[PDB]
Amino acid sequence: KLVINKDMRTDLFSPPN
Amino acid sequence: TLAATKRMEAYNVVNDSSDEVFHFDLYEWYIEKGWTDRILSIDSPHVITYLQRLAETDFRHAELLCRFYTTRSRFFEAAQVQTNLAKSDLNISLKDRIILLSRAKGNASVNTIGISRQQQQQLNHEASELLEIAHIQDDLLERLVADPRIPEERKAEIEEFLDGPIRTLTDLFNDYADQANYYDLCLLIFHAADFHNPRTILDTWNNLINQSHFEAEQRREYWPIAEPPLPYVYVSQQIQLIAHRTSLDSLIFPVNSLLPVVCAYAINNGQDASIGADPCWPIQLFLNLGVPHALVVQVLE
Amino acid sequence: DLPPVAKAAQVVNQTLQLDDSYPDLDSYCRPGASSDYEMQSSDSSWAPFHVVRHHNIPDKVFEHLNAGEVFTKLGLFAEIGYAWASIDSSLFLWDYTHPNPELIGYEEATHTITAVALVPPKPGVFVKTITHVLVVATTSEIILLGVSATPTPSGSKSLTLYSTRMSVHRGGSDVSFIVGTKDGRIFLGGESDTDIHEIFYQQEERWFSSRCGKINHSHPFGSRQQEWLRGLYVDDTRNLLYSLSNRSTIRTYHMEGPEKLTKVIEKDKTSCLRDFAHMADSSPLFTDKTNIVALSPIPATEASKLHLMALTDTGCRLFLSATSSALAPQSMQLQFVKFPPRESPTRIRTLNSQLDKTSRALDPSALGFRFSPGYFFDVVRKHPNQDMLFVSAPDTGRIKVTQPASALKYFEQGTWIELENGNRTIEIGLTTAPFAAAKQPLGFGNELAVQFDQVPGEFAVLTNTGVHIVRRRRLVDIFAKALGNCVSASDDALEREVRKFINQYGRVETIAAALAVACGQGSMDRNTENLARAAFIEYGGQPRLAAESVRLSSRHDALALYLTRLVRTLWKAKVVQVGSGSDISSTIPTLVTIQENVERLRNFLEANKSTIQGLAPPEDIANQKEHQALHALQKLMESISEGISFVLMLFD
Amino acid sequence: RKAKLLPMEEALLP
Amino acid sequence: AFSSLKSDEAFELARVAKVLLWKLEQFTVGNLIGDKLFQLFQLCLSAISQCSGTPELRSLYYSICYRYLTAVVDTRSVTNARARTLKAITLYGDRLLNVICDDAYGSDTTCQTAAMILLNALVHTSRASVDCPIIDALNRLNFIGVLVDSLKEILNEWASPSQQYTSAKLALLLQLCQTRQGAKYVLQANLFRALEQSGVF
Amino acid sequence: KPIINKVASVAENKGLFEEAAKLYDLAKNADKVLELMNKLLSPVVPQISAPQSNKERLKNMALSIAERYRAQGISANKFVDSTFYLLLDLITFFDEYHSGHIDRAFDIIERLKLVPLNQESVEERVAAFRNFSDEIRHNLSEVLLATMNILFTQFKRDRDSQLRSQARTLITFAGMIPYRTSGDTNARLVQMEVLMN
């Protein structure tokens, strides 16, 4: 079961908080 | 010997007793002495309850219960625990869960007396699926951590999330694999997810070939400790790596379309006799990979 | 002018000549002295040696040892992987590589056993299935046994004993030392006197002779003095036998004929001390109170002049030359001294040019062994209870980089190995095949050239608790483990670690090591290989023109160097051997490994065609001729692969 | 176990 | 869509196809029927190779493939169908036959019977296509060995379900003794001593 | 060359492999000789080699074809060829195993690097099994059991930890490999490991 969702992710190249 | 008689007389009193609180305290003490093979030989059913109740909160005790079953040749029952343990909420590293599922896949591959053929494959299929996913997740984490493009602050946030239980392919694809433009691992996810889409599969193959050609041409331009390979060689490596790992599924490895692409790349990027390459290296690649001759000639036609 | 694979073959030929010009022992141990050491912690990634495994003495002999009444002894047969223990008139062999070994016993002996040795058999005496002869000396007899150490089938050599009906009376002189030659000659000596005896043995029964005899090669007259032996030492390459006495007298005998033995030199401690005095540097570590506790012959293939090394109990290594007046030698002279290192073993790491001639770090040295091309083991008995092991090797890297010839010194890499306390070292023996990079002194000691042809030297260290295995670590082993320490570490931490290697081994040698590790050579392993690859790229340098003419990058030289070393055994070798229609020179299994190695190299080049500078197509003349030279090397590889693939097809 | 000592006949030729 | 997902909906849909296959311009209809019968033949062998569902559902698949290999395939059109039909069987290999061999002499009474009769159609249609790969696979899986061993005490086993089961058992052995290669594997099983302990004669 | 293949071709089509091999070998067609020799060996790999058996009569011809193919430097494609010399090694592994030479037989299987013995090699060994000739995967069941029974015997005779670790390795490998009689085999393998502890 795979579902691509380019819309809302988490910037892999920016730190958190 | 009468020495051996007094031994058997002693261990019959112990193994036959109906006091199971004594058995538990006895099994707890056998471990503290490292008498592992002793616990396994016991045929009492109080040992199964002890090991089962301890496997639930101790990984290294669930280990013995799995060893207990496998010396007795109850192979399914072991894979049943190894799989149910990899899916657990217990603090187990991902690389251990890869071992568990890899042992579970083996223990569930052979017949075991009493258990059906369907329930045997029902467990082998489940374990094999997870192992394929866990291998992606492991190879993904390994590459993300070593990725200079990623901040050292995020890498720690990733490693905690990935280095443990096995996540969904959706999580692995979106928040990680696709963003980093890991095209090769994106294909493995499509295969492991039975992803039906001929175009995106082919679009990803094109990006994987180009990004591979670039990494190899930059290297050849730099030479970089040893003489790097010509571009098509590194491109050929990245297909073989998928081909063995995909097991040549028709969906993510469609010779109907991919072979023209590789043959096109061999022309548009001039990987031919000009650089000392075998001009028929695209054909040599697919044939040796296990593609039927009758199909390759059907495509070149 | 010249085609690609022909130009590359020229570089290979020149490269071969470079490796075979590695300095000989005589030229970096010239008359004078040295104290040059770089010490390394045992646990360091730079350690020249390390312990690899230990095999406990089986319990069934511990029982027999305590059942001993008067005499017990332990010993090693490292060349077949067996150990032995004698208890009074009984003998027990066992394979120490095996986990639950069977005891091979021989209890026919009537009197206490005093020495046992494993020797080559005399040709044309026994059936071909007999690999060795077991000599067992008691207080009454010297007994010979047949031995077959044939390799059934997995670990060590399965071992069977055969009686021979060959025994000689022991005579009046104790036997504690038994040595054998290539051709099966058996020499004896002991602690009663300095005499050397030889055992003859024959196939036939003759009426006037016997199958088995013993003669005394020394013959003394009256007027004797108390003196006995400490060890016997054979050097087959010069047909010499050396004895060492308790007074530290070194005697040299020449095997001029097949059954003759002749004393040709006798050098007492006084002569060594006079020689040592005429040296520019005298020292308190060598006086008339000092004892020589061991010798180690140096074969003619390693050095012409330096024949022998002698170890003092203060840790000094004396290198003695010997010359003919014209062949046997007639004179022996102390030429060169290697003085002890200063660093003593520590638990906690410690903060690290004149000749150091006063160190006591090796005082007292109880036992000592030297193996080609200079591996030194010293058993230092600082305390009466535990031995410390000092182990050093020539700093091969610095030795071959050093320029000019007059700057050559005996540079060494050393370390201390502690085997856990309470056990005494008894013997140290070579388990792998004898080292040799060439067939003459020049090129002989080049460890770098053979790190992919030869197994690294392994050594069995026998104590009273077990056998410890010590392994020589190669350049690629050190480079790989060092990189392993750079995985989690920084970016400019790699550059730092690499420069250490460059300042010692040189840029080309360093990059060649990175290439090798990138190709799977070396002792997560993927991170290490990727790190090696990175070093090969970022530090490989670049082509430039000199003062038309171009100087290729170190990356190119490294590649030519690595490729050459993979094919060095077969390059100049004949493909076949003919007696009337038969054989292949290089074995079938070795050609496969050579091929697999070369194909690994080729693969690495293609898999990084893009990022290796010079592989992809291209101030200009430099980069262009760089591109041409790399192309030539790659065409040679596939040619090498084809060629081997062809020879394998022939004998198929 | 005392090691079995095979005979001289096999050992030495011919 | 439910070939190997659940074993409850296929049962109701597996038996309806069974009876339908037995209760059976004309050229156009004949092509559509034979086309689906070929596609329906694939999903059956696919489930048998994975050992899906209960022995009851696994038994219905044997009857469908039985009549298909006995009536449909059994003249250029016949050669093409027979050739392509054998390809599907060879695709799975020992994985498929292993499941069928285990069903025989099992706990269920109808599954072992259908499985035994199914092997007869496979070897029969294979010879029509001097050797055969189907019979060879049975020897590697130790099927012929255990099969000859069961011949002992046949008097105890022999309308009744046990009687019809033995009929298919002995009937299969008779087919292997017709090909030249069968005598080699069959003779090595020592069947002469197996039929003597039973005392049937 | 053609008729010897014609005659060899029909005899091959009539399941007369032992003859088709001799005939193909007469025309020095190693591609077919080794192919057929792979089929004749795989069934007999774990069997007991006894005087005049079908194992001896096939092993001894295979070795007479190994020498003449090495002394003359002949070889088929590496797939057919690799499997052929691999089976010959395994045939030696069981001939040593059935003779009680446990130590010697253990050493052979270790060289082949076919069954992992240290956990680190499991990943690569498992991938190799995927592309190894089915004439090899067939006999994987008997190889694991013999190797286990080998460690099993050596245990009853630190070393204990080492055997225990290797015992585990075999199980996890077998767990991740789908192969012949994986049910009975995976169970027996686990039982033999329990008795060790």
**How far apart (Å, rounded) are the C-alpha atoms in residues C103 and C193?**
35
For chain A, percent helix, then strand, then coil, each to nearest 5?
Answer: 0, 0, 100
Is C162 within 8 Å of D5 when comparing Cβ atoms? Answer: yes
C16 CB-near residues (< 8 Å, 6+ apart): C564, C568, C571, C572
Breaks (C-N over 2.5 A) in chain E follow: 24, 74, 129, 158
- What phi-psi label fits residue D9: left (phi over 0), alpha (psi between -120 and 50 degrees) or beta? alpha
Determine how many CB atoms are found less than 10 A away from the CB of residue F157.
Answer: 11
**How far apart (Å, rounded) are the C-alpha atoms in residues B108 and F171?**
11
Among F129, F130, F53, F124, CA closest to F91: F53
Strand ranges across the sheet with C365-371: C37-40, C412-417, C388-394, C375-380, C365-371
Strand ranges across the sheet with C212-216: C177-180, C186-189, C197-201, C212-216
- What the block records as the tokens of B269 is 């990027």
Contact residues, chain D, for C107 at CB < 8 Å: 2
As a whole number of Å, the CA-based R_g of chain D is: 9
Interface of B with E in 130-189 (CB under 8 A): none
Q: Tell me the residue type at C303.
A: A
CB C341 within 8 A of CB C35: yes
Breaks (C-N over 2.5 A) in chain C follow: 326, 352, 523, 547, 618
Cα C384 → chain centroid:
29
**How far apart (Å, rounded) are the C-alpha atoms in residues C234 and C213?**
21
Chains B and D touch (3+ CB pairs under 8 A): no
CB B232 within 8 A of CB B210: no
Largest separation between any pair of C-alpha atoms in chain A: 30
* C470 beta partners: C51, C459
Buried b (16+ CB within 10 A) or exposed e, F37-55: bbebbbbbbbbebeeeeeb
Q: If residue C85 lies in a helix (H) or strand (E), which one and from where to where? A: strand C82-87
DSSP string, C216-232: ESS---S------EEEE
Instruction: Please give the sequence-ordered ranges of beta strands (E in DSSP) within C219-284, or none if there are none.
Output: 229-235, 240-245, 250-254, 262-267
- Cβ neighbourhood burial of C246 (10 Å; 0-12, 13-18, 19+): middle
Length of chain B: 301
**How far apart (Å, rounded) are the C-alpha atoms in residues C117 and C415?**
31
Q: If residue F36 lies in a helix (H) or strand (E), which one and from where to where? A: helix F30-41
**How far apart (Å, rounded) are the C-alpha atoms in residues B204 and B261?**
12
Chains F and A touch (3+ CB pairs under 8 A): no
Residue E70 DSSP label? I
Is C126 within 8 Å of D13 when comparing Cβ atoms? Answer: yes
**How far apart (Å, rounded) are the C-alpha atoms in residues C483 and B124?**
40
**How far apart (Å, rounded) are the C-alpha atoms in residues C379 and C649?**
52
CB C104 within 8 A of CB C93: yes
Among C637, C532, C635, CA closest to C594: C637
Determine how many CB atoms are found less than 10 A away from the CB of residue E88.
Answer: 15
- Cβ neighbourhood burial of E164 (10 Å; 0-12, 13-18, 19+): middle
Contact status of A6 with chain B (Cβ, < 8 Å): yes
**How far apart (Å, rounded) are the C-alpha atoms in residues C397 and C544?**
25
* C461 beta partners: C428, C468
Is C648 within 8 Å of F72 when comparing Cβ atoms? Answer: no
The whole-angstrom distance between D7's CA and the closest CA on chain C is 6
**How far apart (Å, rounded) are the C-alpha atoms in residues F54 and E145?**
17
SS3 for C544-594, per residue? EECCCCEECCHHHHHHHHHHHHHCCCCCCCCCECCCCCCCECCCHHHHHHH
Among C184, C290, C181, C183, CA closest to C242: C181
Backbone angles phi and psi of C96, in degrees to 5? -80, -15
> Which of F176, F184, F195 comes nearest B111 by C-beta?
F184
**How far apart (Å, rounded) are the C-alpha atoms in residues C367 and C259?**
32
State how beta strands C317-323 and C331-338 pair: antiparallel
SS3 for C507-553, per residue? HHHHHHHHHHHHCCCCCCHHHHHHHHHHHHHHCCCCCEECCCCEECC
Is B117 within 8 Å of E54 when comparing Cβ atoms? Answer: no
Length of chain F: 197
Question: Which residues of chain C have a Cβ shorter than 8 Å from any chain F Cβ?
Answer: 98-100, 152-155, 158, 588, 647-652
Contacts by C469-472, CB closer than 8 A, 24 or more apart? C469/C51, C469/C52, C469/C53, C469/C54, C469/C55, C469/C431, C470/C49, C470/C50, C470/C51, C470/C52, C470/C391, C470/C417, C471/C49, C471/C50, C471/C51, C471/C52, C472/C48, C472/C49, C472/C375, C472/C393, C472/C447
Residue among F141, F180, F181, F182 with most chain E CBs within 10 A, to mutate: F180
**How far apart (Å, rounded) are the C-alpha atoms in residues C446 and C474?**
11
**How far apart (Å, rounded) are the C-alpha atoms in residues B184 and F100?**
49
As a whole number of Å, the CA-based R_g of chain B is: 26
State how beta strands C197-201 and C240-245 pair: unpaired
Q: Tell me the residue type at C102.
A: E
Contact status of E51 with chain B (Cβ, < 8 Å): yes
CB C256 within 8 A of CB C328: yes
Determine how many CB atoms are found less than 10 A away from the CB of residue C201.
Answer: 22
Residue C127 DSSP label? -
CB C252 within 8 A of CB C239: no
Is C162 within 8 Å of D13 when comparing Cβ atoms? Answer: no
CB B252 within 8 A of CB B191: yes
Contact residues, chain E, for F14 at CB < 8 Å: 130-131, 180
- What the block records as the tokens of B106 is 């083996």
The whole-angstrom distance between F160's CA and the closest CA on chain E is 36
CB B105 within 8 A of CB B153: no
> Which of B150, B174, B190 comes nearest A5 by C-beta?
B174
Is E54 within 8 Å of B118 when comparing Cβ atoms? Answer: yes
Strand ranges across the sheet with C240-245: C229-235, C240-245, C250-254, C262-267
Determine how many CB atoms are found less than 10 A away from the CB of residue F9.
Answer: 16
Cα C209–Cα C214–Cα C219 angle in degrees, nearest 5: 115
Contact residues, chain F, for E182 at CB < 8 Å: none
Is F15 within 8 Å of E140 when comparing Cβ atoms? Answer: no
Contact status of B120 with chain E (Cβ, < 8 Å): yes
Three-state DSSP class for residue C152: coil
Contact status of C561 with chain D (Cβ, < 8 Å): no
Residue among B41, B69, B82, B103 with most chain F CBs within 10 A, to mutate: B103
A-chain residue closest to B176, CA distance:
A12
Determine how many CB atoms are found less than 10 A away from the CB of residue C135.
Answer: 22
The owner of tokens 């150990």 is C83
**How far apart (Å, rounded) are the C-alpha atoms in residues C61 and C466?**
12
Euclidean distance between the first and the last CA atom of chain A, given in angstroms as a whole number: 30
Q: Chains C and D: how many Cβ contacts under 8 Å?
A: 51
CB F116 within 8 A of CB F165: no
Chains E and C touch (3+ CB pairs under 8 A): no
Cα C127 → chain centroid:
31
- What phi-psi label fits residue C165: left (phi over 0), alpha (psi between -120 and 50 degrees) or beta? left
Q: Tell me the residue type at C112.
A: T
CB F172 within 8 A of CB B102: yes
Among C218, C251, C232, CA closest to C137: C232
* C39 beta partners: C414
Contact status of F13 with chain E (Cβ, < 8 Å): yes
* E43 beta partners: none
The owner of tokens 């182990």 is C391
As a whole number of Å, the CA-based R_g of chain C is: 27
Q: If residue C6 lies in a helix (H) or strand (E), which one and from where to where? A: helix C4-19
Cα E36–Cα E39–Cα E40 angle in degrees, nearest 5: 80
- What the block records as the tokens of C510 is 């360093």
**How far apart (Å, rounded) are the C-alpha atoms in residues B40 and B69?**
9
Among B266, B158, B256, CA closest to B213: B266
* C576 beta partners: C584
DSSP string, B34-45: T-HHHHHH---S
Among C50, C42, C51, CA closest to C346: C42
- What the block records as the tokens of B66 is 């799995």
Cα F196 → chain centroid:
26
**How far apart (Å, rounded) are the C-alpha atoms in residues C309 and C297?**
6
**How far apart (Å, rounded) are the C-alpha atoms in residues F68 and F55?**
20
State how beta strands C229-235 and C240-245 pair: antiparallel
The owner of tokens 């002194």 is C441
- Cβ neighbourhood burial of B52 (10 Å; 0-12, 13-18, 19+): middle
- What the block records as the tokens of F174 is 């077998």
**How far apart (Å, rounded) are the C-alpha atoms in residues F82 and F100?**
27
Q: Where are the alpha helices (DSSP H) in chain B?
A: 2-16, 20-32, 36-41, 46-55, 59-71, 75-86, 94-107, 117-145, 152-162, 169-172, 183-192, 198-222, 231-246, 255-268, 281-288, 293-300
**How far apart (Å, rounded) are the C-alpha atoms in residues B59 and B164?**
13
Q: Chains C and F: how many Cβ contacts under 8 Å?
A: 51
**How far apart (Å, rounded) are the C-alpha atoms in residues C460 and C471?**
9
Contact status of A7 with chain B (Cβ, < 8 Å): no
B-chain residue closest to A15, CA distance:
B154
The whole-angstrom distance between E184's CA and the closest CA on chain F is 11
Residue D6 DSSP label? B
**How far apart (Å, rounded) are the C-alpha atoms in residues F185 and F190?**
9
Strand ranges across the sheet with C32-34: C32-34, C331-338, C317-323, C306-312, C292-297
Residue C473 DSSP label? P
Cα B150 → chain centroid:
25
Contact residues, chain F, for C588 at CB < 8 Å: 70
CB F48 within 8 A of CB F90: no
**How far apart (Å, rounded) are the C-alpha atoms in residues B218 and C538?**
12
> Which of C153, C648, C652 comes nearest F107 by C-beta?
C153
State how beta strands C466-472 and C49-56 pair: antiparallel
- Cβ neighbourhood burial of B153 (10 Å; 0-12, 13-18, 19+): exposed
**How far apart (Å, rounded) are the C-alpha atoms in residues F138 and F154?**
26
* C338 beta partners: C34, C317
Length of chain A: 17
**How far apart (Å, rounded) are the C-alpha atoms in residues E155 and E152?**
8
- Cβ neighbourhood burial of C330 (10 Å; 0-12, 13-18, 19+): middle
* C294 beta partners: C311
Residue B110 DSSP label? B
Among C163, C84, C46, C65, CA closest to C483: C46
- What the block records as the tokens of C604 is 């690495």
Cα C565 → chain centroid:
19
Cα distances (angstroms) measured from residue F59 to each of F26, F49, F104: 18, 9, 19
Three-state DSSP class for residue F28: coil
- What the block records as the tokens of C210 is 């016997």
Cα distances (angstroms) measured from residue E183 to each of E136, E178, E191, E199: 12, 8, 11, 24
Cα C557 → chain centroid:
28
Determine how many CB atoms are found less than 10 A away from the CB of residue F105.
Answer: 24
**How far apart (Å, rounded) are the C-alpha atoms in residues F136 and F128?**
11
Three-state DSSP class for residue F85: helix
Length of chain E: 201
Three-state DSSP class for residue E149: helix
Among C345, C338, C387, CA closest to C366: C387
Three-state DSSP class for residue C44: coil
